[PDB]
């Protein structure tokens, strides 16, 4: 999640302009976004034409 | 003497780090080479940067 990146996230689910103005803020999550037996409520695009 | 496909290796999520110097991973599918050499070895994790 940065300008001028490629990958399974950058091309299929969230592409930023390579002329991007702004801020990318991130933090780890382990209280809400994870469970035992895994959290399966999170989907991403794995194939796109 | 073969047909290579670097998108399969690239789209696979199993790799921890992937740095290309001089080339970009999405152009490797079009470009072709006189030879390719695979130098294969195991290192310590903090030494991957070297």
Swiss-Prot record, chain A:
Effect after changing residue 43 to R: In strain: Delta/B.1.617.2, Epsilon/B.1.427/B.1.429, Kappa/B.1.617.1, Lambda/C.37, 19B/501Y, Omicron/BA.4, Omicron/BA.5, Omicron/BQ.1.1; Contributes to cellular immunity evasion and increases infectivity
Record note on what altering residue 8 to T does: In strain: Gamma/P.1
Q: Where is this region: Immunodominant HLA epitope recognized by the CD8+?
A: 39-47
Result after altering residue 47 to L: In strain: Omicron/EG.5.1
| Effect ascribed to mutating residue 36 to P | In strain: Omicron/XBB.1.5, Omicron/EG.5.1
Function recorded in the entry: Attaches the virion to the cell membrane by interacting with host receptor, initiating the infection. The major receptor is host ACE2. When S2/S2' has been cleaved, binding to the receptor triggers direct fusion at the cell membrane. When S2/S2' has not been cleaved, binding to the receptor results in internalization of the virus by endocytosis using host TFRC and GRM2 and leading to fusion of the virion membrane with the host endosomal membrane. Alternatively, may use NRP1/NRP2 and integrin as entry receptors.
On assembly, the entry states: Binds to host ACE2. RBD also interacts with the N-linked glycan on 'Asn-90' of ACE2. Cleavage of S generates a polybasic C-terminal sequence on S1 that binds to host Neuropilin-1 (NRP1) and Neuropilin-2 (NRP2) receptors. Interacts with host integrin alpha-5/beta-1 (ITGA5:ITGB1) and with ACE2 in complex with integrin alpha-5/beta-1 (ITGA5:ITGB1). May interact via cytoplasmic c-terminus with M protein. May interact (via N-terminus) with host bilirubin and biliverdin, thereby preventing antibody binding to the SARS-CoV-2 spike NTD via an allosteric mechanism.
This chain's protein is named: Spike protein S1
Q: Which organism is it from?
A: Severe acute respiratory syndrome coronavirus 2
């Amino acid at each position: 999640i940065a300008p001028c990146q490629t990958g399974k996230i950058a091309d299929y689910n969230y592409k930023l302009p390579d002329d991007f103005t702004g801020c990318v803020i991130a933090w780890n999550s382990n209280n809400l976004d994870s469970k035992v037996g895994g959290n399966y409520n999170y989907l991403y695009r794995l194939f796109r034409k | 003497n073969c047909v290579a496909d670097y998108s399969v290796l690239y789209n696979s999520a199993s790799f921890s780090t992937f740095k290309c110097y001089g080339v970009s991973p999405t152009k490797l599918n079009d470009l072709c080479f006189t030879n390719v050499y695979a130098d294969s070895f195991v290192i310590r994790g903090d030494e991957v940067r070297q």
